Amino acid sequence: LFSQIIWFVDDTNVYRVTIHKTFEGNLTTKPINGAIFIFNPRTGQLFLKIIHTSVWAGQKRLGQLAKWKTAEEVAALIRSLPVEEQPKQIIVTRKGMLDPLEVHLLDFPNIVIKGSELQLPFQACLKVEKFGDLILKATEPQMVLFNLYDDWLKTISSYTAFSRLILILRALHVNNDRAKVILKPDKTTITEPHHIWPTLTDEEWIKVEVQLKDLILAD
Ligand SMILES: [Cl-]
Ligand SMILES: [Co+2]
Ligand SMILES: [Co+2]
C-alpha cells in the first residue's frame, strides 16, 4: 500500500435484516438499509453507497444476490470516475466478492482484484451515529463521500493514519462501549461536526492507540 490507487471494498453490510419472533412463534425477517464501504487507505477517502431496501424488491436469496449488487455498484462508481481517478487494485474484504467483481469488471483490464485476510470491520461504522443514522433513515439509494482520516494527514503519514483507523474500527467491533470511552479521554473531548473521530492531542492519541490495541488483544 501507499504508492497506485487502491480501494478496499467491504460488502458485509449490504444485505441487513431484522429478525423478530412473532406472537405466533415464527421468525419474520425484514430487510433494512445497508451500505457498501469503498475505501482508499492512502488518502482516507470513503465512498459510502447506501443500499435502500427498494433494491431487493421482487428478489430472492438476497444474501447471495447482495454480492452481485455490490459488484454492480462498484463498477458503476468506476465508470462515473475519470480514468485518472479509477483504482489500479481492488482488495475485497470477503472472498465471495471475487467472482462477481471479476465479471462486472471485464471492461477494466487495468484493474487487479484480490482478496485479503486483513481484519477491516467497516461494520463498526454502523455504530458511529453519523453513519448509522444516515443509513437507517435513507429513503432511496445514494452515495456519500467521507474523509475517514479527518485532519490527521496534516501531521502523520498515511501508514500511521491507516493503522490508527484500523485500531479504532477493530476496537469498536470487539467492544463498542469500551472503545467509545477510550476515545473520550476527557469530559471536554469533542468531535468537530465535519469530522468522524475526536479532536485529540498527539499524546492523547498515543495512549488511545495502546488502549485500543489492548482491547482488541483482550477480545
Ligand atoms: Cl505512508
Ligand atoms: Co441495476
Ligand atoms: Co477537518
Q: Are residues 137 and 175 in the same domain?
A: no
Residue 14: all three cell numbers together: 449490504
Residue 218: all three cell numbers together: 483482550
Q: HEC string of 93-104?
A: CCHHHHHHHHHH
What is the span of the domain harbouring residue 48? 1-150
Q: Which of 150, 176, 196 is a domain's end point?
A: 150
Beta strands in 52-192 (DSSP E): 89-92, 112-114, 142-147
Structural domains of the chain, count = 2
Quote the ligand 1 centre to 166 CA distance (angstroms): 15
Count other C-beta atoms under 10 Å from residue 99's C-beta. Answer: 13
Q: Which of 101, 117, 150 is a domain's end point?
A: 150
Quote the ligand 1 centre to 61 CA distance (angstroms): 41
Residue entry with cell 419474520 = 28
**Which ligand neighbours the alpha carbon of 197 most closely?**
3
Residue entry with cell 449488487 = 69
Quote the ligand 2 centre to 57 CA distance (angstroms): 12
Written as one letter, the residue type at 161 is: A
Quote the ligand 2 centre to 197 CA distance (angstroms): 34
In this structure, what CATH number is given to the domain that contains residue 161? 1.20.80.40
Bridge partners (DSSP) of residue 37 are 10, 48
State how far the Cα of 116 lies from the Cα of 133, in Å rounded to an integer. Answer: 29
Resolution of the coordinates in A? 1.5
Q: Is 202 helix (H, G, I), strand (E, B) or coil?
A: helix
Q: Are residues 127 and 86 in the same domain?
A: yes
Quote the ligand 1 centre to 159 CA distance (angstroms): 4
Q: What letter would DSSP give residue 146?
A: E
